[PDB]
Amino acid sequence: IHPPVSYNDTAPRILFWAQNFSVAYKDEWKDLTSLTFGVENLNLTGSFWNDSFAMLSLTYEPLFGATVTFKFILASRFYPVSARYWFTMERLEIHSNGSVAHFNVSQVTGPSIYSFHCEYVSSLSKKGSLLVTNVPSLWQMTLHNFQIQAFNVTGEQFSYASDCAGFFSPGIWMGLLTTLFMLFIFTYGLHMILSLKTMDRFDD
Amino acid sequence: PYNLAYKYNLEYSVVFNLVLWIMTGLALAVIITSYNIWNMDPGYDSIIYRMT
Amino acid sequence: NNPEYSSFFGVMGASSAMVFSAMGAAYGTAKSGTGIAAMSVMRPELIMKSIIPVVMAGIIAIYGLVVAVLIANSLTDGITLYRSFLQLGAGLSVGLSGLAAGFAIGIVGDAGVRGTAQQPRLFVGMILILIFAEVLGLYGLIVALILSTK
Amino acid sequence: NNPEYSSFFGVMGASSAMVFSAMGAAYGTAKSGTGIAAMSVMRPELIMKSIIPVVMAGIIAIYGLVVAVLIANSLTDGITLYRSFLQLGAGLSVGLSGLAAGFAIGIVGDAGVRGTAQQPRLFVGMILILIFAEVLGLYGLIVALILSTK
Amino acid sequence: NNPEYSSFFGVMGASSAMVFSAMGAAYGTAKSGTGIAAMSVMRPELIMKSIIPVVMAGIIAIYGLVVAVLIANSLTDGITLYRSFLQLGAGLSVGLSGLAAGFAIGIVGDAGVRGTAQQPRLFVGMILILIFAEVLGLYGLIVALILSTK
Amino acid sequence: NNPEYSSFFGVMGASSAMVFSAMGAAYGTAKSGTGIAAMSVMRPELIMKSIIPVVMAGIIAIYGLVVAVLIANSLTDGITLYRSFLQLGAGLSVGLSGLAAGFAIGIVGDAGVRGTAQQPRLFVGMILILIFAEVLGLYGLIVALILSTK
Amino acid sequence: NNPEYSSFFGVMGASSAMVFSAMGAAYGTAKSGTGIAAMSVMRPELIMKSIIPVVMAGIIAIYGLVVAVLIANSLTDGITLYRSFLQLGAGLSVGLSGLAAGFAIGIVGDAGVRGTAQQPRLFVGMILILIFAEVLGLYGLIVALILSTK
Amino acid sequence: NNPEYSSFFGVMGASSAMVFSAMGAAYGTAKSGTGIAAMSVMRPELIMKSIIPVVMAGIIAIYGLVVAVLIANSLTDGITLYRSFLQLGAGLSVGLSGLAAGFAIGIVGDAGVRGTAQQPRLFVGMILILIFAEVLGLYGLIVALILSTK
Amino acid sequence: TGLELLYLGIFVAFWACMIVVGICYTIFDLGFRFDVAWFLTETSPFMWSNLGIGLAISLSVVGAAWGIYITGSSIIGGGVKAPRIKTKNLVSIIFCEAVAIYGIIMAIVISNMAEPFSATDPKAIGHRNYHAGYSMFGAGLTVGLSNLFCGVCVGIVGSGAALADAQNPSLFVKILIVEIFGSAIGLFGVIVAILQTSRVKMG
Numbered sequence A: 001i002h003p004p005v006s007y008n009d010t011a012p013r014i015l016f017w018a019q020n021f022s023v024a025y026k027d028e029w030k031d032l033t034s035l036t037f038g039v040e041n042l043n044l045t046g047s048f049w050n051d052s053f054a055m056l057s058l059t060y061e062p063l064f065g066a067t068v069t070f071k072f073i074l075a076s077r078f079y080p081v082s083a084r085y086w087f088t089m090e091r092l093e094i095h096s097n098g099s100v101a102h103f104n105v106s107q108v109t110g111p112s113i114y115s116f117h118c119e120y121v122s123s124l125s126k127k128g129s130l131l132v133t134n135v136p137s138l139w140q141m142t143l144h145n146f147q148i149q150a151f152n153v154t155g156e157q158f159s160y161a162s163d164c165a166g167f168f169s170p171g172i173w174m175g176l177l178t179t180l181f182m183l184f185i186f187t188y189g190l191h192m193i194l195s196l197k198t199m200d201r202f203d204d
Numbered sequence B: 001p002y003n004l005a006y007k008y009n010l011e012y013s014v015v016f017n018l019v020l021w022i023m024t025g026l027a028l029a030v031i032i033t034s035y036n037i038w039n040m041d042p043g044y045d046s047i048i049y050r051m052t
Numbered sequence C, D, E, F, G, H: 001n002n003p004e005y006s007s008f009f010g011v012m013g014a015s016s017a018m019v020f021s022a023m024g025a026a027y028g029t030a031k032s033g034t035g036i037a038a039m040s041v042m043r044p045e046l047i048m049k050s051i052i053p054v055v056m057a058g059i060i061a062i063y064g065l066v067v068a069v070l071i072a073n074s075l076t077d078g079i080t081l082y083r084s085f086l087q088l089g090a091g092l093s094v095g096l097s098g099l100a101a102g103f104a105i106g107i108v109g110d111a112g113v114r115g116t117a118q119q120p121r122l123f124v125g126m127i128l129i130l131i132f133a134e135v136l137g138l139y140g141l142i143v144a145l146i147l148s149t150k
Numbered sequence I: 001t002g003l004e005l006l007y008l009g010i011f012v013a014f015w016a017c018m019i020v021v022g023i024c025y026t027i028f029d030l031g032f033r034f035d036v037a038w039f040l041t042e043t044s045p046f047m048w049s050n051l052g053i054g055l056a057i058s059l060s061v062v063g064a065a066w067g068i069y070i071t072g073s074s075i076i077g078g079g080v081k082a083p084r085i086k087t088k089n090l091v092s093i094i095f096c097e098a099v100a101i102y103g104i105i106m107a108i109v110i111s112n113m114a115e116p117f118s119a120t121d122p123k124a125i126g127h128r129n130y131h132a133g134y135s136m137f138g139a140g141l142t143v144g145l146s147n148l149f150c151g152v153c154v155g156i157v158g159s160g161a162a163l164a165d166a167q168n169p170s171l172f173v174k175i176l177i178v179e180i181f182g183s184a185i186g187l188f189g190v191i192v193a194i195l196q197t198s199r200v201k202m203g
């Protein structure tokens, strides 16, 4: 198990782990897990850690004939409807030659005291598509078993890990409510039909 | 090590709901059938009043 | 763009429009039928006159079918969530309205067939009630036509 | 994109089409059967003429089988969730309309076969009502096709 | 590479294919049983001839078993989710069609075996009805096979 | 590696294979017992013969036990999720088929034991019906084995 | 620095305090009501004397109202989750204690007014029992206050 | 700003205030009317007086309406979660208090109307009890107002 | 009571599951997973609005049919010996049907407030659209259930009045008042629904 990428400002602040980390340019794919987790010379320069804003910049020197830099930008703030600080990975920013490609990250959120884990935090539709864009982009990304904690990181250990994998999803919830209403209607209809009784006698 | 999270499958919602509702429906069907057989009319009403 | 599940709800609407309406009609066609079987032993000549409730129950089913078809012909692959839930609302409207109207028609016809057997003057009276019950289902259909074409 | 679980609904369509219709037909074959057994003790000659309700329940089962096979012969591996939802809707419509029609045929056919032992003139009446019940299942079948062959 | 849970639905199919059908068969073999006993007190000579409904119910179980074995042989460690859903649907169809057919066979067989003591001419009639019920299970089996071997 | 919770399902298979079977058997025995009591008040000589249903119920329990023990011997800490599902399906199939066969044997044994007190000729018939019920459990066992050994 | 949904529970206190108590009171005022009517036909002079149960039931409602108003005056936008839980607990305590007291008062009052029509001496006894039932509601109020004024 | 979903609880508050109060008023009117109609054949001159309970039941509906109107006028798309919860609590309080008061009024009015048909002196007594039930609804209104205005 | 037993079992099992699930979520510090906000927000406003319209029409029709058959059975039973009932007591049926009419009207008044968004992000959908969906659902519930109860009540009162009419002609004219009262509830519901969707605007 390769160790997590641990940015340090007097102590571990941003921990980033991924069973796989692959990136593609013009449909040309490449694996970065070996070049990312466990490498002691990782070009983490450009990272930053506010008290309430984190930027993890992983840079690779010869990638795709240029120095590429993936910046994961998260921010945690106090949400009034609770007393909890909730951190969300706001976006991803791929810097290539004098150029920037932005990816929105959809469902990477959770209490700032808990890391966030999600299988296939990827830009592919087949793999969740949490990295999404409306401007067509030449970049694609796949982080398999992506677990990140930017705030409240104590020591080398990820805190408990909220994850996108839930019991229900908006589509499942809508379908279940529709089916529940229609099951109520069908149960009413079937109860009234089953109450049908036939006469046991006929007039002389 | 590193307290890595449990590798939940991204489709957890789908399989959880599929299994939960399929098995709930199957259990309800089995219960209803077993009640319709257990509470079946004994069929010897022609013999209830002869034995009793 | 739109979620891949957006077409579910509309489809269910269509099916609901067919299912519940049919159930309604079925109940009517059952109850009235029972009543006719009870009436016809003493007053056979009234069988044809007393078949009106069943027909009205059938009409209810037709309404559902209409809406179902109207929704089953409008389901496109990229059906948006707005149209999907409009069709779901139309389906629920027509289906539950037809169910209730079929129950009312069945009960009223089962009573009125026997009543007309006893008192001929009740025949028209029975009809004057049945149509009311029937249009309840119609009202649902109307709203469906308002919804699925909003 | 074409999730791994897209086929499930389509499958639950075919099963439904075969299951619920069968249930309906079973009811139509069960209830009516009892009536015939009750009637045939005194009027043996009408036993064969009075099997029509059973035949109509069997026709409901045949509608169910038709839609179930028509769905099972269209379940490709990468079936889109839209097409699988269409197949589920078709299966539910046919199956539950056939279930309601089976209930109606059971009640009507049993009452009619028992009454016809008393008043033969009711026979035709019964048949008409049975037809009005049978069409209900047919309606479902229609909608099912309109959904499944879409 | 396939999901590890994919086999689950598969086995359920098989299990269901052998459970519900069995349940149906049980009901048959139960209800007819009682009827036969109630008939034997007066008309003993009709015992063997009246074992037919039980046999019919037994055949329903066979259907289930057959499909179950089919599914129980089509299960593999890497069974795709699509094939697993197909097997679950085949199991549901066969099991529940056999359940409905067994209930219908039980009711019809009890009624007809009780009647045949009074009116012998009913025997043949009963047989026809039983066939009309039995075919229901057959339909399920057919669909099951179409889904299972697809 | 395999999930730590896999064995759970397999274990339940085993337990189900013994639980539901037992329940089935219980029911069978129970009802048969009651019948024998009502039969013994007038025909004590048939006390030992009328125990046949109880035996045919007890055998069902044995089926369950077999499968349970079989599953209990195929369990391992690193049992693949697929094998655990296979064993759960086998357990459910045997247990619930045995439950259905226990219902059928209980009802048939009660009715036939009461009847044979009055019509000795029914005894053979009763046996046949009991067999036609017992095989149901056997069917489950077969499927269970096919699932368990696989 | 408190959740904005904290007030929810507190509100569900107030609401509950006025709802459940009312329900309880209603039951009292219902059952006793009927009793008075039933006993008013033969013994009209006891109508006013036999109105004590209703009055007691009415008092139960007042209890709830008091607590409800108290809670409704202790609510604030920044109410801490702790105070909100206290108010929910007080509301549930008073409401359900009043519900139980209303059930007891209704049953006891109906029985007592019916008996006093036949046994005058029972009147005082009834009153005593009613007081005991009333005390139950009072207890709730006490606890509610202790919870609602911390 | 406030949450997007905040208005949900206020909407449900208005809906509850109207729905449950309407349920209570409808039950009170139905029960009282079916008592009054049945009495009138015996005591035709009492109907008008006996209409008093119905009016009381109607008043319950008004209470709901009143509170509903408040919640429907103070409810904007951007109300704080606190005010939305307050409106939900007011609506639930008025609605369920009106439901309980309507049940009590229906029971008491029916019983007292029949008793007055049998015992005129009961009339005044009935009124008292009805007031004691009617006040319950009033209590809810009070609390609802206190919650909705806060 | 077999079906009643099934319903009671389902209800008890569901609510025991809910109690245990809430206890587990609260106690295991997993409350943040029980986002009611996420449920109310991700769920499309179109679902709420269309369920509201469908209920507004369907529950009103259900109440109208319930009352119609409740009072028509009595009308046609009484009229066997006093056929005059069929002529005079149709008013009861009329009242029941009136309920359904309100339904469709409110459905229209609700269906006119619908409009697509072209947005999926809750910040994009916005308070206006979410409140429009919730208020359309609430107005549908109010009108549908008020009409259901009003129709059932009017049907019960009409059956009573028809049974009373069969024995004394001069009673219906004085019992119709009850029906009028029973009808008012329907109107009340409609009014409230109109007040709930007065300031509703999707888009």
Ligand SMILES: CCCCCCCCCCCCCCCCCC(=O)OC[C@H](COP(=O)([O-])OCC[N+](C)(C)C)OC(=O)CCCCCCCCCCCCCCCCC
Pocket: A128, A169, A170, A171, A172, A174, A175, A176, A179, A182, A183, A186, B010, B011, B012, B013, B014, B015, B017, B018, B019, B021, B022, B025, B026, B029, C005, C008, C015, C016, C019, C020, D005, D012, D092, D096, E092
């Ligand atoms: C006329 C009406 C008759 C009566 C009513 C019966 C209707 C039953 C219809 C089928 C069930 C539908 C349930 C809700 C799901 C609707 C689909 C949907 O929106 O899903 C899209 C969603 C979209 O997902 P998503 O993208 O929103 O999820 C977020 C992303 N992931 C998934 C990666 C986390 O996908 C699914 O298909 C979800 C799975 C839902 C499956 C629910 C289980 C249903 C079980 C069937 C019933 C039991 C059968 C056995 C019975 C035994 C014999 C009696």
Ligand SMILES: CCCCCCCCCCCCCCCCCC(=O)OC[C@H](COP(=O)([O-])OCC[N+](C)(C)C)OC(=O)CCCCCCCCCCCCCCCCC
Pocket: A163, A165, A166, A167, B008, B012, B024, B028, I009, I010, I012, I013, I014, I016, I017, I020, I021, I022, I024, I025, I028, I030, I033
């Ligand atoms: C019988 C009639 C037919 C059935 C009709 C009723 C159907 C009821 C519908 C059930 C759905 C319930 C929602 C499931 C999701 C919530 C589960 C939960 O709280 O735990 C997960 C929550 C949240 O889990 P989490 O968020 O840590 O997990 C990570 C997230 N996932 C799993 C999605 C990747 O808490 C736990 O982790 C608790 C673990 C222990 C499980 C406790 C479950 C509670 C119930 C157990 C006993 C059963 C109750 C009934 C008793 C017997 C019958 C009366």
Ligand SMILES: CCCCCCCCCCCCCCCCCC(=O)OC[C@H](COP(=O)([O-])OCC[N+](C)(C)C)OC(=O)CCCCCCCCCCCCCCCCC
Pocket: A160, I020, I024, I028, I029, I030
């Ligand atoms: C009389 C009824 C019999 C009692 C039992 C009823 C059935 C309940 C069992 C349901 C199956 C669930 C079994 C556990 C499954 C694994 C869950 C898991 O991973 O847990 C993680 C959960 C949640 O994750 P966590 O809390 O461990 O992780 C840390 C999370 N943070 C950092 C946020 C705190 O916690 C556990 O470890 C739970 C272990 C024990 C769970 C036992 C089941 C809960 C329900 C028990 C019954 C409740 C009522 C008790 C009183 C009854 C009296 C009548």
Ligand SMILES: CCCCCCCCCCCCCCCCCC(=O)OC[C@H](COP(=O)([O-])OCC[N+](C)(C)C)OC(=O)CCCCCCCCCCCCCCCCC
Pocket: A082, A083, A084, G003, G081, I015, I018, I019, I021, I022, I023, I025, I026, I027, I029, I030, I031, I032, I034
């Ligand atoms: C049967 C009739 C209905 C009543 C019983 C069932 C009610 C609930 C049914 C719906 C499903 C469960 C809802 C609760 C979901 C959990 C919400 C959550 O985790 O957040 C909690 C919230 C927030 O949790 P949190 O972890 O965010 O904590 C707050 C932390 N800060 C402030 C920093 C954000 O707080 C609560 O504890 C609120 C109380 C409700 C949760 C408990 C539900 C109670 C269930 C019934 C059993 C009661 C126990 C006593 C038994 C005897 C009763 C007389």
Ligand SMILES: CCCCCCCCCCCCCCCCCCCC(=O)O[C@H](COC(=O)CCCCCCCCCCCCCC)COP(=O)(O)OCCN
Pocket: A164, A165, A166, A167, A168, A169, A176, A177, A179, A180, A183, B021, B022, B025, I021, I032, I033, I034, I035, I036, I037, I038, I039
């Ligand atoms: C076989 C037949 C066909 C299939 C069956 C269809 C019919 C039955 C289905 C009806 C629904 C039953 C299940 C209800 C579950 C209640 C909530 C479960 C608790 C839970 O864990 O939910 C969390 C969210 O819940 C929430 O956000 C809480 C929302 C609760 C709303 C419940 C409303 C409906 C049910 C009760 C009311 C019924 C009346 C109708 C309104 C999930 O958390 P996660 O980890 O997935 O979250 C991910 C992001 N945080």
Ligand SMILES: CCCCCCCCCCCCCCCCCCCC(=O)O[C@H](COC(=O)CCCCCCCCCCCCCC)COP(=O)(O)OCCN
Pocket: B007, B008, B009, B011, B012, B015, B016, B019, B020, B023, B024, B027, E003, E004, E005, E008, F003, F009, F012, F013, F015, F016, F019, F020, F088
């Ligand atoms: C008399 C005693 C006998 C008892 C009676 C019989 C009862 C026996 C049990 C039957 C019911 C449940 C059977 C198994 C359910 C699980 C099926 C999926 C298997 C599973 O765990 O899948 C994982 C994914 O699951 C997921 O992602 C979701 C899994 C969650 C499923 C929860 C189902 C709810 C409960 C259903 C039954 C309720 C009522 C039953 C009557 C693995 O897959 P992976 O690829 O993730 O591998 C791991 C790497 N990540």
Ligand SMILES: CCCCCCCCCCCCCCCCCCCC(=O)O[C@H](COC(=O)CCCCCCCCCCCCCC)COP(=O)(O)OCCN
Pocket: B023, B026, B027, B028, B030, B031, B034, B035, B038, B039, E012, E015, E016, E019, E020, F092, F093, F096
């Ligand atoms: C492949 C096939 C599908 C696989 C999945 C299914 C797995 C198995 C689970 C389904 C149930 C199997 C066991 C059969 C139950 C037999 C039902 C007999 C019904 C019966 O006669 O009992 C009535 C009471 O009903 C009752 O008491 C109802 C039965 C009891 C409920 C059973 C469930 C227990 C609860 C489960 C808890 C665990 C849930 C998970 C958290 C009494 O009839 P009467 O009222 O006239 O009585 C008057 C005389 N006494």
Ligand SMILES: CCCCCCCCCCCCCCCCCCCC(=O)O[C@H](COC(=O)CCCCCCCCCCCCCC)COP(=O)(O)OCCN
Pocket: A183, A184, A187, A190, A194, B028, B031, B032, B035, B036, B039, I001, I002, I003, I004, I005, I006, I007, I009, I010, I011, I013
């Ligand atoms: C109590 C112990 C703990 C139980 C916990 C487990 C959950 C509950 C399961 C049931 C447990 C009790 C046993 C009841 C068996 C079913 C009901 C009785 C038998 C039955 O269904 O047959 C007839 C209905 O026909 C039918 O077979 C139709 C029923 C099937 C309809 C399925 C549609 C509903 C789906 C659920 C969603 C709706 C939710 C609504 C709240 C009703 O018999 P009878 O009363 O006429 O004759 C009197 C004797 N049977």
Ligand SMILES: CCCCCCCCCCCCCCCCCCCC(=O)O[C@H](COC(=O)CCCCCCCCCCCCCC)COP(=O)(O)OCCN
Pocket: A079, A080, A081, A082, A086, A109, G005, G008, G009, G012, H012, H016, I031, I032, I033, I034, I035, I036, I037, I038
């Ligand atoms: C003794 C019996 C038990 C009595 C106790 C009451 C039981 C009520 C059952 C409901 C559940 C309990 C209520 C408290 C838990 C609410 C969920 C809190 C979880 C949480 O943190 O979610 C927030 C959103 O939820 C919220 O803020 C949701 C607020 C609304 C909660 C209450 C709604 C319950 C449903 C009421 C329906 C009434 C229907 C009437 C006909 C976060 O949100 P964030 O802003 O931090 O998001 C940050 C995203 N980046």
Ligand SMILES: *[C@@H]1O[C@H](CO)[C@@H](O[C@@H]2O[C@H](CO)[C@@H](O)[C@H](O)[C@H]2NC(C)=O)[C@H](O)[C@H]1NC(C)=O
Pocket: A019, A020, A021, A022, A029, A030, A031, A033, A034
């Ligand atoms: C991470 O996944 C990559 C692919 O995204 C794996 O490498 C690929 O392996 C497949 C299968 O052998 C080949 O077809 C590809 O050409 C490989 N690389 C690329 C860039 O496409 C890689 O083994 C995985 N690494 C882990 C899990 O550490």
Ligand SMILES: *[C@@H]1O[C@H](CO)[C@@H](O[C@@H]2O[C@H](CO)[C@@H](O)[C@H](O)[C@H]2NC(C)=O)[C@H](O)[C@H]1NC(C)=O
Pocket: A043, A044, A045, A046, A059, A061, A067, A069, A095
């Ligand atoms: C370590 O990473 C930094 C940050 O990327 C590299 O310095 C420059 O970073 C900017 C901002 O992303 C890029 O636009 C430049 O191209 C980077 N310069 C070069 C020369 O690549 C820095 O070079 C990295 N250091 C090492 C030793 O690899």
Ligand SMILES: *[C@@H]1O[C@H](CO)[C@@H](O[C@@H]2O[C@H](CO)[C@@H](O)[C@H](O)[C@H]2NC(C)=O)[C@H](O)[C@H]1NC(C)=O
Pocket: A003, A004, A005, A006, A007, A008, A012, A015, A044, A156, A157, B002
């Ligand atoms: C930040 O400090 C951490 C903790 O020491 C370093 O990461 C650990 O390094 C040790 C060896 O010193 C390994 O055994 C652990 O597996 C590592 N854990 C993690 C979570 O990474 C890390 O190298 C330091 N980072 C920098 C940029 O200096």
Ligand SMILES: CC(C)CCC[C@@H](C)[C@H]1CC[C@H]2[C@@H]3CC=C4C[C@@H](O)CC[C@]4(C)[C@H]3CC[C@]12C
Pocket: D062, D065, D066, D067, D069, D070, D073
């Ligand atoms: C035993 C008998 C009575 C059963 C009913 C008759 C059978 C032989 C016939 C009648 C109509 C037929 C169906 C008609 C149309 C199609 C659509 C086609 O794409 C697949 C086959 C399918 C679905 C047929 C299957 C067989 C079928 C069901």
Ligand SMILES: CC(C)CCC[C@@H](C)[C@H]1CC[C@H]2[C@@H]3CC=C4C[C@@H](O)CC[C@]4(C)[C@H]3CC[C@]12C
Pocket: F065, F066, F067, F069, F070, F073
């Ligand atoms: C039923 C009649 C034939 C008696 C046979 C015994 C029954 C109970 C069967 C059921 C399951 C069987 C066991 C299943 C598995 C094993 C493990 C194997 O390595 C040795 C044999 C052994 C231990 C079997 C012995 C026989 C067994 C116990």
Ligand SMILES: CC(C)CCC[C@@H](C)[C@H]1CC[C@H]2[C@@H]3CC=C4C[C@@H](O)CC[C@]4(C)[C@H]3CC[C@]12C
Pocket: F138, F141, F142, F143, F145, F146, F149, F150
């Ligand atoms: C009740 C008694 C008389 C039944 C005995 C019949 C015999 C011949 C039957 C009953 C069950 C059958 C078994 C069922 C399943 C399996 C598992 C499979 O992987 C190999 C064959 C095997 C092991 C079968 C062999 C034959 C078998 C043992």
